[PDB]
Design a protein around this nucleic acid. Sequence first.
RNA 1: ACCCGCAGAAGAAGCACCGGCUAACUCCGUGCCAGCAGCCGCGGUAAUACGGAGGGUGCAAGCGUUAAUCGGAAUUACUGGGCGUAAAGCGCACGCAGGCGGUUUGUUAAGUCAGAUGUGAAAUCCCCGGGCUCAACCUGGGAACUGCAUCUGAUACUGGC
RNA 2: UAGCUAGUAGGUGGGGUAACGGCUCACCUAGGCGACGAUCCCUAGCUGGUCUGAGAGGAUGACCAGCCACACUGGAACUG
Lengths: 80, 205, 123, 150, 80, 129
Amino acid sequence: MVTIRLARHGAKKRPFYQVVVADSRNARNGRFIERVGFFNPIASEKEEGTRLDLDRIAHWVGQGATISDRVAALIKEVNK
Amino acid sequence: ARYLGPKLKLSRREGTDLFLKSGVRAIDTKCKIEQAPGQHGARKPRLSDYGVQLREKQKVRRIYGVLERQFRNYYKEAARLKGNTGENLLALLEGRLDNVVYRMGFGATRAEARQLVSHKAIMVNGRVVNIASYQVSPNDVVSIREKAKKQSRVKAALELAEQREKPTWLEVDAGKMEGTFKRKPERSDLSADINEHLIVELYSK
Amino acid sequence: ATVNQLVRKPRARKVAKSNVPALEACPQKRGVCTRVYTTTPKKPNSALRKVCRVRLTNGFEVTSYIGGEGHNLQEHSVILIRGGRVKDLPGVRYHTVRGALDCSGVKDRKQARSKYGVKRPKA
Amino acid sequence: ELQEKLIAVNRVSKTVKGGRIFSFTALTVVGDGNGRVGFGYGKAREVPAAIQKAMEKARRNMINVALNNGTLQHPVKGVHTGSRVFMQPASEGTGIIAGGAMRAVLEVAGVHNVLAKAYGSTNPINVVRATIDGLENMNSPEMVAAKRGK
Amino acid sequence: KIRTLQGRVVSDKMEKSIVVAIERFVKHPIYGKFIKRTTKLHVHDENNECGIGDVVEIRECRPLSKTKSWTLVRVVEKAV
Amino acid sequence: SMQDPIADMLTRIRNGQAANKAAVTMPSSKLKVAIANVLKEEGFIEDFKVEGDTKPELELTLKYFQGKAVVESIQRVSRPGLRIYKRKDELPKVMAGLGIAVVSTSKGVMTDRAARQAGLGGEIICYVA
RNA sequence: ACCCGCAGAAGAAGCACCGGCUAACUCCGUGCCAGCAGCCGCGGUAAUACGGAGGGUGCAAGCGUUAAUCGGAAUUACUGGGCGUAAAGCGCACGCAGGCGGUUUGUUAAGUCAGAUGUGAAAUCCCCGGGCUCAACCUGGGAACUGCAUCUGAUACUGGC
RNA sequence: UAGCUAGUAGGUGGGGUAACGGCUCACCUAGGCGACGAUCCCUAGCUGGUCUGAGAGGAUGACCAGCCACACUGGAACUG
């Protein structure tokens, strides 16, 4: 019922990709419960483009929320 | 937008120099200022208070070539942080790239400087520029591209820049043809004839 | 000067509504010609003013002015109108405009052509 | 350091035997750019001579005030008939603001920023002479020390 | 403490209801004066200690009838 | 004027100095003598005298020094019907900061200078220049 | 996406306006006619307003033009008005609810203000960054959103006893 | 717009429901509301907000945020 998922942002052609905890109900980008990081595609050519709150994520998935396999693969990019 | 009359027609209607159609003659010749005043102003009109006002508003605009919708935007930006529209307006015109490329001597006029940007001949901070209506800030570096350094109009503009007072707001080197902005301009350091008495009271009664 | 009276009788204001009410908030309206005529001679201004009566699908019928030099408008012809007062006419607040299937265009016009709509002369 | 300002100038019409006659009238102020201003009205044949008659009235009396930071010592009120004028002191060198029928009376006395407003009827002679009544309403210093401040 | 109100009994004979008036002040949104506002409700009573124009103390309970979701606790003046 | 006796307290003073009088008289009350000490403490008056007990009257002696009047403006803003309330940080600065505002708080009258320091607000009594 | 070149002026300017308000107009055409507007009106043989010639003035891949919503409009006044005569006291006496009410000791604490716990989401207005031709925008942080809901305190004052 | 209800106004026992309720069948009475504007027709979904202005106020909700209603037009049940 609640998933740790992606939110595209940036309207047309200019995505920002935020990672959020959200219900399967209502919104597809906004209306989220808690933000847990970002996956920004244009990060000034620096490694600052990816952030993930692994402690809060572990508590959300522990308590019963779904973690996406796409986000589980991205946990490796913040070490680790 | 353009001006399709002879560019000295403006200065000959004003009875004052506006820095228009400039090159290796520098000043006064064959500007015919007060020698060919035309069909009006000899004989300078009294007219309405709405004269100065409009004809004084045009004289503070056309000297920078700025369009009315730009001029209203600079009046909005000059009305920021209590800086005074009689003062902080000058920084938005004198700090504009088609004035900076002119003050650096790459163009002999603000029109010719604006043309050099529309012809992609200029760089700002190592990247090419095509927009000339843009603000420059301290530590920004402006230069002419090697593919355009040999144009006779730039050659003449640099020889005219040596016949002009040097600005205290920006630097330029004639050997690299590269200049850098240093500080934003001030009324009592610009020390020249430009209005105050109308740019303190625009768009209101 | 008392404090609780406007709870008993709130004070009223005048809304400006319309001087061109048949438009129903549109820049133009289409209708049919019912009559083509000229107005009665009026004021020390001496002229022969061209007018038509126009009927609209919304229950309005209005008199409208026929600008431009010369016209041949028939009755039952479909026409467009635009709002605006003309004081040389009696109570007229509408202009009938030349974009019509039966109506003639203005001729011998080289300048000011964005009004009435005239194409640039050959040679 | 004498300076003069024209605020308004117009023609007038008058009835005579079987017809009318035309003449000129002006509204002016005169000041010293540092503490005083006087107000003038005048009518004449020829427009420069009408303006000059108003300048001579503006020299017939002047009001002398102790300007503070190029603005007002305190808030002031001025009145003439239906024309009521109020002025709040201005901060940060900005705040000007106010039309010529208030501003011209103050820009001739040395005022740089002021938050003046006019109320009621907008006959500019009445507004100008109510601005002068507001200059008779201002007080001097910053000396009596009767208040803690500020 | 529990939710209580005081008021005067407007209507006292309704078998198993009494009608109470509750008074408070509120600001008028345009004319700025704080004006009096009065609200009415039905209150449940089985014990008959009050009468018309007598003063009561009441609590909120469960909805039972049209505008009756409150019940009587005590009488506050009692003399008379 | 008995329907607003504190508006009348200000009226008697505003018209008293317009007539350039030294003394102003009114019927006495605890709030009028609480305000009279605020007016003495700002130096608009040099004395406030109560006579009678037995038709008690309050007589205020105006303090004329260094020129005409004792105040330039003396507005009440509040009214018994239209009561005007300010929060501790919404207290206005009267006379471009050269004047006082007075508030009744929850214990009695004080100036905006003291209401600021105490962290208090309340109903407006006067704005004085 | 982004960036660089090639022979060549190469394919490239129109629209409105010109007495008074509100700047630009001289000379003609017409001659109360024909056609303009926001308003007076412009026009009868020397019409700045209509049409034409040559120019001027403003804007420009636009230019003019308008229904529809606000400001100006204090012209409905809550901020912010008037009632002798311009716009208005309603022909004149009594009077219930409504609304108003001197001065002081208690007391309730609804209202008020204070304090605290929640709220005023994402945006957005304002200041300063990041990133896409400038800027918008999309984004990052501040500052705001002067408000609102409740639980305690104080009772100057309005209500209440 | 000066009339408006009538499961309306106040009680009683079952049945229905996750559960208040005249939800629903019976039975026990006759009121209840309103000029301090009840109530009914005409038009219209509402709001984050947007537009205007110094603000009050005025306008308005597409587009970007959030509910409701609605599924040829009218009507009936199941499933949950």
